[PDB]
Amino acid sequence: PAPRELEVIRSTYITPHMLRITLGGAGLAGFPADQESAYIKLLFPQAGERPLMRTYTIRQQRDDEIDVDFVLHDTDGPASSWAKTAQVGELIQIGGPGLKKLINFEADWFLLAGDMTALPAISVNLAKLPNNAVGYAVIEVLSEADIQPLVHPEHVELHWVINPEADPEGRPLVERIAQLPWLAGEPAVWIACEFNSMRALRRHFKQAHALPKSHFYTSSYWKIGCNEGEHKLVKQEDEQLENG
Ligand SMILES: Cc1cc2nc3c(=O)[nH]c(=O)nc-3n(C[C@H](O)[C@H](O)[C@H](O)COP(=O)(O)OP(=O)(O)OC[C@H]3O[C@@H](n4cnc5c(N)ncnc54)[C@H](O)[C@@H]3O)c2cc1C
Ligand SMILES: [Ca+2]
Ligand SMILES: [Ca+2]
Ligand SMILES: [Cl-]
C-alpha cells in the first residue's frame, strides 16, 4: 500500500506550543470518513534509508482536509521541526488512518487525562461525550498560555496541570488526579501521555482503585530521552510485560 501525498493548506498557531497544520489536496481522495481522534503516520526522508515515521492525531476532519496539531516540544525531531518550517503548498506523505480509541461511553462518570500530545484526542473525546456526562479531564500543558478553551459537557471539569519540564518520575498528572474526589458508580478512564507519567497513573489505579481494561485505557505517546523509534521498543516491551 502506497502513502498519500498531501498538501499543506494552512499553518495556524493555536497556542504558543501548539501549531495546527491543515492538510489537503487530491491525495486525500477516498480517505475514510469519521476519523477524528484516529492517528496517522507522517513519513520523513532519510537519505539512502527507510523513511522515518512519526505518529499524529487527526484533530479535525472536513470532507476536503484534515487538521493535525503539533506540540512544539523541546529537542526538535523530524516532525516538530517540519511543522515549524512547513510552507503552504508543501507536500508530505502519510500512512493511516489507524483506528481511533475513544473513551468507553458506557459508564457513570469519566476521567480523561494526558499531556499536550494527547490534547487533540482528548479534545475529540470531550466533544463527543454526552451533554450530561460527569467527571474530570486533567491535562498537562507547558504554560498558562497553552491552556485552551475546549468544548466539553458542563459537568465535566477541566483541570490543567502546568508543567514546563516533563518529569521523568511521572508525578505531576497522577498527583493532581489523586486529589480529585472519586464519584459514585463505575468510571471509564482514558489516559495518554509520556511513558513514565502513564506508568505512574497506571500504578496508582492498580494499587488504589482496580478497574477492568474495557473501562481503563492507557497509552504511552512518547518517552523522555527517546525518539519515536526508541519509544516504540519500550512501548512494546511494556505492553508485553503488562499483558502477560
Ligand atoms: C497515537 C499517538 C498519537 C499522537 N498524536 C500526537 C499529536 O497529535 N500531536 C503531537 O504533538 N504528538 C502526538 N503524538 C506524540 C508524537 O508521536 C511524539 O511527540 C513524537 O516523538 C514527535 O516526533 P518528533 O519527530 O518531533 O520527535 P522525535 O524524533 O520522536 O524525538 C525527538 C526528541 O523529542 C522528544 N519528544 C518527542 N515528543 C515530545 C513531546 N511532545 N514533549 C517533549 N519532548 C518530546 C523525544 O524524547 C526526543 O528526545 C502522538 C503519539 C501517539 C503514539
Ligand atoms: Ca464533577
Ligand atoms: Ca485514586
Ligand atoms: Cl504498573
The cell for 208 is: 488504589
| Residue closest to 96 by CA, chosen among 40, 147, 138, 54 | 40
CA distance 156 to 159: 10
CATH of the domain at 231: 3.40.50.80
CA distance 102 to 38: 9
- Phi–psi pair at 206, nearest 5 degrees: -70, -40
Experimental method: X-ray
CA distance 39 to 49: 24
DSSP the chain: -PPEEEEEEEEEEEETTEEEEEEESGGGTTPPS--TT-EEEEEE--TTSPPEEEEEE--EEETTEEEEEEE--SS--HHHHHHHHPPTT-EEEEEEEEPP----SSSSEEEEEEEGGGHHHHHHHHHHS-TT-EEEEEEEESSGGG-------TEEEEEEEE-SS--TT-HHHHHHHTTSPPPSS-EEEEEEEEHHHHHHHHHHHHHH----GGGEEEEEEE-TT--HHHHHHHHHHHHHHHT-
Which of 100, 120, 140 finishes a domain?
100
My answer on whether 106 and 225 are in the same domain is: yes
| Residue closest to 91 by CA, chosen among 1, 32, 3, 2 | 3
Strand partners, 70: 19
Indicate the number of domains in the chain: 2
Is 23 in contact with 9 (CB distance < 8 Å)? yes
Task: Give the CA count within 13 Å in the CB-facing half-sphere of 76.
Answer: 8
Is 130 in contact with 91 (CB distance < 8 Å)? no
Task: Give the CA count within 13 Å in the CB-facing half-sphere of 174.
Answer: 22
* Residues by chain with Cβ below 5 Å of ion ligand 3: 208-209
My answer on whether 126 and 151 are in the same domain is: yes
The cell for 239 is: 505492553
Is 137 in contact with 113 (CB distance < 8 Å)? yes
Q: Best of 40, 80, 235 to mutate for ligand 1, by most ligand atoms within 8 A of CB?
A: 80
CA distance 109 to 167: 28
Identify the burial level of 25 via C-beta atoms within 10 angstroms of its C-beta, where 0-12 means exposed, 13-18 middle and 19 or more buried: middle
| Residue closest to 67 by CA, chosen among 134, 138, 121 | 121
Ligand 1 pocket, CB under 6 A: 39, 54-57, 69-71, 73-75, 77-80, 117, 120, 166, 221-222, 224-228
- In terms of residue numbers, what domain contains 87? 1-100
Q: Best of 222, 224, 231, 239 to mutate for ligand 1, by most ligand atoms within 8 A of CB?
A: 222
Which of 100, 129, 161 finishes a domain?
100
Cα end-to-end span (Å), the chain:
32
Return the residue whose CA atom lies nearest to atom 19 of ligand 1.
222
- Compute how many other C-beta atoms are within 10 angstroms of the C-beta atom of residue 149: 6
CATH of the domain at 50: 2.40.30.10
Gap from CA of 202 to ligand 4 centroid (Å): 5
Gap from CA of 153 to ligand 4 centroid (Å): 30
Which of 39, 71, 100 finishes a domain?
100
Q: Best of 227, 230, 231, 236 to mutate for ligand 1, by most ligand atoms within 8 A of CB?
A: 227
CA distance 137 to 107: 15
My answer on whether 174 and 94 are in the same domain is: no
Longest alpha-carbon distance in the chain:
58
My answer on whether 13 and 127 are in the same domain is: no
My answer on whether 111 and 220 are in the same domain is: yes
Gap from CA of 226 to ligand 1 centroid (Å): 9
My answer on whether 117 and 181 are in the same domain is: yes
My answer on whether 123 and 56 are in the same domain is: no
124: CB partners within 8 A, 6+ apart: 36, 37, 57, 59, 102
